[PDB]
Design an enzyme around this catalytic site. Structure first.
Site, PDB file in Angstrom:
ATOM      1  N   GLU A   1      -5.624   7.180  -1.937  1.00 40.29           N
ATOM      2  CA  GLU A   1      -5.372   6.022  -1.105  1.00 40.29           C
ATOM      3  C   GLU A   1      -6.196   4.842  -1.545  1.00 40.29           C
ATOM      4  O   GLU A   1      -5.790   3.706  -1.315  1.00 40.29           O
ATOM      5  CB  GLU A   1      -5.634   6.298   0.365  1.00 40.29           C
ATOM      6  CG  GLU A   1      -4.706   7.301   0.931  1.00 40.29           C
ATOM      7  CD  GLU A   1      -3.271   6.895   0.792  1.00 40.29           C
ATOM      8  OE1 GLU A   1      -2.956   5.703   0.978  1.00 40.29           O
ATOM      9  OE2 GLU A   1      -2.454   7.780   0.483  1.00 40.29           O
TER      10      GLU A   1
ATOM     11  N   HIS B   1       2.247   4.086  -3.834  1.00 36.80           N
ATOM     12  CA  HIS B   1       2.048   5.521  -3.957  1.00 36.80           C
ATOM     13  C   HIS B   1       2.868   6.112  -5.081  1.00 36.80           C
ATOM     14  O   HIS B   1       2.414   7.031  -5.763  1.00 36.80           O
ATOM     15  CB  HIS B   1       2.367   6.259  -2.672  1.00 36.80           C
ATOM     16  CG  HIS B   1       1.194   6.435  -1.768  1.00 36.80           C
ATOM     17  ND1 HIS B   1       0.843   5.512  -0.810  1.00 36.80           N
ATOM     18  CD2 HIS B   1       0.303   7.446  -1.660  1.00 36.80           C
ATOM     19  CE1 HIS B   1      -0.218   5.944  -0.152  1.00 36.80           C
ATOM     20  NE2 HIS B   1      -0.565   7.117  -0.649  1.00 36.80           N
TER      21      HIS B   1
ATOM     22  N   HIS C   1       0.813  -1.205   0.000  1.00 40.62           N
ATOM     23  CA  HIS C   1       0.000   0.000   0.000  1.00 40.62           C
ATOM     24  C   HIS C   1       0.843   1.249   0.000  1.00 40.62           C
ATOM     25  O   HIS C   1       0.425   2.284  -0.526  1.00 40.62           O
ATOM     26  CB  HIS C   1      -0.921   0.142   1.193  1.00 40.62           C
ATOM     27  CG  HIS C   1      -1.419   1.536   1.315  1.00 40.62           C
ATOM     28  ND1 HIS C   1      -0.949   2.399   2.272  1.00 40.62           N
ATOM     29  CD2 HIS C   1      -2.294   2.240   0.566  1.00 40.62           C
ATOM     30  CE1 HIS C   1      -1.464   3.595   2.063  1.00 40.62           C
ATOM     31  NE2 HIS C   1      -2.284   3.527   1.034  1.00 40.62           N
ATOM     32  N   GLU C   2       2.005   1.203   0.612  1.00 42.09           N
ATOM     33  CA  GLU C   2       2.772   2.416   0.543  1.00 42.09           C
ATOM     34  C   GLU C   2       3.461   2.531  -0.791  1.00 42.09           C
ATOM     35  O   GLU C   2       3.198   3.450  -1.572  1.00 42.09           O
ATOM     36  CB  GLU C   2       3.790   2.457   1.652  1.00 42.09           C
ATOM     37  CG  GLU C   2       4.388   3.761   1.607  1.00 42.09           C
ATOM     38  CD  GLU C   2       3.323   4.772   1.328  1.00 42.09           C
ATOM     39  OE1 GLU C   2       2.424   4.924   2.175  1.00 42.09           O
ATOM     40  OE2 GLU C   2       3.338   5.367   0.233  1.00 42.09           O
TER      41      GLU C   2
ATOM     42  N   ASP D   1      -4.340   1.293  -1.966  1.00 44.50           N
ATOM     43  CA  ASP D   1      -4.710  -0.002  -1.426  1.00 44.50           C
ATOM     44  C   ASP D   1      -4.791  -1.030  -2.530  1.00 44.50           C
ATOM     45  O   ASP D   1      -3.958  -1.941  -2.621  1.00 44.50           O
ATOM     46  CB  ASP D   1      -6.054   0.083  -0.729  1.00 44.50           C
ATOM     47  CG  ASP D   1      -6.157   1.267   0.159  1.00 44.50           C
ATOM     48  OD1 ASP D   1      -5.220   1.451   0.960  1.00 44.50           O
ATOM     49  OD2 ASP D   1      -7.169   2.002   0.069  1.00 44.50           O
TER      50      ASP D   1
END
Lengths: 566, 583, 596
Positions: free
Chosen positions: A460, A411, A407-408, A464
């Site tokens: 976000e 980005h 999830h990070e 995810d």
């Protein structure tokens, strides 16, 4: 055929506690997953993270109490004990880290990764940004005069009355000036630097704290401030004052956000296996994510500045000096340590830009990522209870660390992540842009449970969808190497590994919240509202629907119009 | 049943024609009203209706003075090459003008002075009307200018790069323009990105719609001197006579710190369209013409009067009933806001009766036909109106547009309702539907998020909330949008219901050709007719995302859907995609 | 389309109250016809049947007419007018007048209509139909029933009655024994009496006895007799094992019982109602001769019911035998033919005057219907008032009546579409009609004798069995129902409907089209409206506790369970609401018990 290794039994209790068998595992997936965790807990918002975060903070109070012989530690200790009980604006900002009228902080320039350009952005208020200004909500509008007069009379007469409506009005006039977050989604525009002679006592303003080019993220709000302009001072007092309405927590938390270094060094050193255990997990995802133009981001990843754990500049010498600008002696501390934290981050400006910086304490839990420099950050705190502890079924450590990592990581490839290159700079990609509409549309076809919208958070949201959808594939691979770790957790013999993996993942998110804060949360964050999160992001991953083989028609499996991807 | 007068059977014809029947109304009502019409004809039943009165106009135009004025202007346009010969090379004077207002690619001042010039404002969209607060004299409004593109200049995907689209058009123009040399290229593309850039910004500065409602804060009374610290020149641009005037600039925008030109061009390319130009600019002239056209005026007056007063009565009664949140204070508040509501029909009272007077008020025109020059004239003229009454007293009644235009509007501050297939004597379905729902949309428009502005009332804003969140469930092809519309939107399903509920209490024969449909459900139909508007799919967003109003399909289904009564006139078991109380 | 005529608006106004179109009519039904009614009507300060609605309406209209050459009508009028309302003394006097225990018991029963230990009142016999005959039978007792402590509630209330009595002195604990005495007395009576379902072998409960041991004349206390028939060899023995000390706790009981009777001794109803209960032909004679209208009722039914019967009957030897039966049935509509006045007074000639008023009635009703013994046997009477709302069928006379009363509320009105009335009056009538062919009636025969009307009795039991299955697998919301004790009248209505529906159908096939969509809910044919009606009648919500209370004790099922079961067993309706198969109201799966 299950396992009975006691370490897994400990992790089992946690997941099982929140898991509910009453409801089916397809319809309202989120519901079934943690209906318990809703219905068990007492009464603001409270959730799994806040859970862990608590746990670890308890622990740090513990160790804090235990050893009380580096001076740094000594500081944090004495602190903890003590807690158990134009030019104008600038000057205040300096002394308080309480912002008004302009939020100001410094970091690597976006043009080049060498000089530390000054970012002057519009400020964030205690309440949400665009909650004020709509033909709408009538909230609290007096609570300002309320809390003022409270401490006012304690200071001791009706100037209060006007002063309130006036200051509030100054707010209202400041808010709609700001920019909503709908379009703080484009760095092509905020960046437009000015010099120290362009301001036309801003020179003086900064002199409250440079010859370098100065950057104004918002030129429409900055220009509006010139038309705005004495009584304003009231306003600032308000905010300054307004800062200050088991204490074990709130204390240690304040610490966290303010001595964002000692805390980490006193917790992580109170360890060589952990860092090595996640080292492979981080390298597993990244590459899997990769395997799926292509060359650039390929590089970017291969050059991303990974950093496990916590800073390496954590004997004592460094930890001493880095924070040595302290001196705290025997709660004026609150001030003292507010004036040291904001100054420690502002003092870096003079120094050349780095690639290793650490954006926040290694104490709490969210793998923050700066596209600014280029850096994941998985502060050691996270890799813990139910995300990952050293010996759980790989099911988890993937669904935990592996996840919030992924999830990070992703980005770097969303709405923003595109417009940065591994340097930390700029310049068929339209294809991807299509997907945006897709998600935010399909997503927006779903809602929240109390409003019922989410067109800001595709950031976000997609972060995810990707991160996980990849990670899972990663685990699949990992076990494709071996094929045995499938030993299913004891005390729950009706799910297969893959099942578990999901179950965990869901559980990572649960929360039981007062409706008020829910609707506020809705319009005050870069987040889906968790239920929407779990349910939706699982409406998409195919492999999930597969492992559960929830046949067609049941309201989690409309593959007909398929699930957009990245 | 089914009488056979002339216009009766013909009404039956119209409702019969574009109708479909093989599509169940309790499934897809949107295309039901006019499905065959969509596959046969190739747009609205308004540009239709508009066209109609337009023809009627020229039919009076074959032959006082104000007429003469129009007919001449009409000529000016309709002299075909006067739409060609000038725009061929009238650039000769476009130079005169343009360079009279600057340089070029490769050489705040003019900023607005274009108003008196061609009323193609930019960077100060301005006009006068009643001081919103101290209502006895008009004053100014100097606000952000509407942008040629809709609001969407952002990373907002739906436009995010499609901005480039405009550039090219722009760029294109320039070269087509740059064809001309009077007194090769690279540099242009840079000019493109400059203009588009200041666009993105000027938007950024500006204020999107949804928030443009708190007149509670859109009111910033400023006197010349805060401007003297932001100009006074600029307004002096708009002089033909005085300074005591108290302007009020709504939108604090980033004052400032090549483009205006970039726009002007973009405005400078058989007959109807010219008459349209007139209607937006010479309101009362062509209008008086319309008056002179039909007599029976008086009878229309009689009738449409009885009708509208009937309906507003009913609506008051509805208020009396809907008291589930409101109360006395609220109530007689309403009662008042109603029985102040002043009323115009067809024409203001300075139009006709000494049959010359308009030619006195409109006495601000002439030329021999010794055009684009005259064009500039008439444009500047419409504006000459939009301000000149700056000086004079606040008038609580003013057709702020021609009677030709075919709409209804509640200029709220004056508190004015005002009106112009035009209701020919038909069975009550029509007469009570068209002008009915128009009475409707207006009458409600004095009580929504606008109306409430000239406690428990929070509950109301909740009602709104409920409607708003309805639509975005239902929409036509990327959905439609919400908050945009609650102003123009919730109008319908208040005002309609107000109206309809008159019909019954006013009561009656089946129609000819077909009769299967008794009156009431017909009333429904004919209403549905008043929107039957073939459109493409690409202009659909263009009228979705831009405008305040909202497109038909919603505005038929999601209207009925939210009125029970239409239950009890179609044989439909309430449980399907067709069948929030609003009042 | 709609016959705009007002009365039709009135009929649509009564059909609108409880329409509830929100819920799909093909999914569930009972909701779609009463849920409104449940909702709007808050529970009037138990069960509030549309019937009792009617009851209020009529009984009111009664009162309205009363207030005003006139003999019995005058009698009543006086009686009622004595209602607007101490006198415990009077009762005490009665007991004292008493205190050969039997003859006592006799006269108590007699002049106070209070039945205890022998609930007896006569009619024709079965086996020899002209000869009036007595009867003796297990009493009828307050609780109807193991598990319960509701027993002890009975206790508490008993002691509290005699306590409130203990107000008057003309020993403040011993009551707290006498209580337990009479309670366990209940228990004995019950625990030997006969529960219900087994009350169908009319074959059995017939054994005759004339002139067992412990008896005293006791018939005296009621006023060469025929053979007193005793319907429970079991019971009327069990007294004999249950008998100078005895007098103390046995009389202890009859008092407390008799007392408990009338504790309480616009509300006007309350007493008027009672009057209708006890002087029934009187108040009836009021009602008709105060509403006087015959044409609309001497025919419509006597058109309807004839249609219905003929249809149903016609839909081996049996078919005929049964036919001759129905063809035979004596069928008394509106009211009997003792009704100018005199003779009305003349049967009713046993009262006059300026709790005494109540006591003069109690003993007058116990004699009134029991005075036929001296006269010849008859097939031509009522069971009860022509002022109630019901319809009963005492096969012992093969008599089917319809009390004029009902025919006004939503079971009949004159100027209404033939739909409504074929679902109201038409139904309950056809209900009756069949109600004499289930295993109650079938045991009788065109006179009232007994060999067996019916072997096809097989097919009969084939119906009954499967129906009980369906029920005890279709349980009301608020915990289930009984079988047989419910089929008892279920099977009836389950048939009677189909009868009435066919009747409607053929009728309207005899008069062209006529289908005039009804003018307040204009969106149906009549047919749908016909259902909607029959649905309606039973619209009633009830006290959640009293729900189960009257779940057991009611012979015939909860409202909902009925209305949304009986329907499920009709292919016709299944069509009429153009629904889809494999839904919640379709027994492709849990097959319909095609009753006929």
């Amino acid at each position: 055929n299950a396992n009975r290794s006691k370490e897994w039994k400990n992790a089992a209790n946690t997941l099982l506690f929140g898991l509910d068998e009453s409801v089916d595992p397809c319809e309202d997936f989120y519901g079934f997953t943690c209906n318990k965790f809703i219905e068990r807990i007492d009464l603001g918002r409270f959730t799994t993270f806040s859970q862990a975060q608590l746990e670890v903070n308890s622990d740090i109070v513990k160790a804090l109490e235990k050893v009380d012989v580096s001076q740094t530690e000594r500081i944090t200790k004495a602190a903890f004990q003590s807690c158990v009980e134009y030019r104008e604006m600038g000057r205040i900002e300096q002394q308080r880290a309480l912002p008004t009228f302009m939020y100001t902080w410094v970091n690597v320039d976006h043009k080049n990764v060498s000089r530390n350009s000054y970012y002057i952005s519009q400020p964030t208020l205690p309440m949400p940004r665009e909650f004020y200004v709509l033909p709408q909500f009538a909230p609290e509008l007096d609570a300002r005069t309320k809390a003022i007069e409270n401490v006012m009379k304690a200071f001791a007469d009706k100037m209060i009355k006007t002063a309130a409506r006036e200051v509030t009005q100054i707010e209202q006039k400041i808010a709609m000036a700001s920019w909503p977050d709908d379009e703080l989604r484009n760095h092509e525009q905020q960046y437009n630097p000015y010099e120290l002679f362009a301001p036309s006592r801003f020179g003086k303003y900064i002199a409250g704290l440079f010859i370098g080019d100065v950057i104004v993220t918002n030129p429409a709000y900055m220009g509006f401030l010139n038309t705005l302009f004495y009584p304003f001072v009231n306003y600032i007092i308000v905010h300054m004052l307004f800062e200050d309405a088991d204490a074990r927590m709130k204390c240690v938390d304040t610490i966290t956000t303010y001595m964002p270094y000692g805390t980490g060094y006193v917790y992580v050193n109170s360890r060589d296996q952990v860092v090595e255990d996640v080292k492979q997990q981080t390298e597993l995802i990244m590459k899997t994510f990769l395997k799926k133009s292509y060359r650039r981001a390929e590089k970017k990843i291969n050059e991303m500045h990974r950093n496990y754990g916590w800073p390496k500049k954590l004997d004592d010498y460094y930890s001493i000096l880095e924070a040595y600008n302290n001196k705290t002696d025997k709660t004026i501390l609150n001030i003292l340590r507010r004036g040291y934290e904001n100054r420690e981050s502002f003092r870096r400006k003079n120094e050349t830009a780095d690639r290793t910086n650490f954006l926040e304490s290694p104490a709490s839990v969210n793998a923050w990522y700066a596209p600014e420099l280029n850096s994941l950050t998985l502060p050691f705190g996270i890799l813990t209870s139910p995300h990952y502890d050293l010996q759980f079924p790989k099911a988890f450590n993937f669904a935990g660390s592996g996840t919030v990592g992924g999830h990070e990581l992703v980005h770097g490839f969303d709405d923003e992540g595109v417009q940065f290159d591994y340097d930390g700079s700029l310049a068929g990609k339209n294809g991807f842009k299509d997907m945006a509409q897709c998600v935010v549309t399909q997503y927006n076809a779903q809602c929240c449970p109390a409003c019922a919208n989410g067109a800001h958070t595709q950031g976000e949201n997609i972060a995810d969808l990707g991160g996980l959808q990849a990670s899972y594939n990663a685990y699949k691979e990992y076990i494709k190497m071996k094929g045995a770790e499938e030993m299913r957790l004891p005390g729950l013999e009706k799910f297969t590994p893959n099942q578990i993996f999901w179950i965990s993942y869901g559980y990572s998110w649960c929360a039981k919240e007062t409706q008020s804060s829910l609707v506020k949360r809705l319009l005050t964050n870069p987040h889906s509202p968790n239920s929407c999160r779990v349910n939706q992001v699982l409406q998409d991953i195919p492999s999930f629907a597969k492992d559960f083989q929830c046949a067609l028609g049941q309201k989690m499996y409309p593959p007909a119009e398929q699930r957009c991807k990245v």
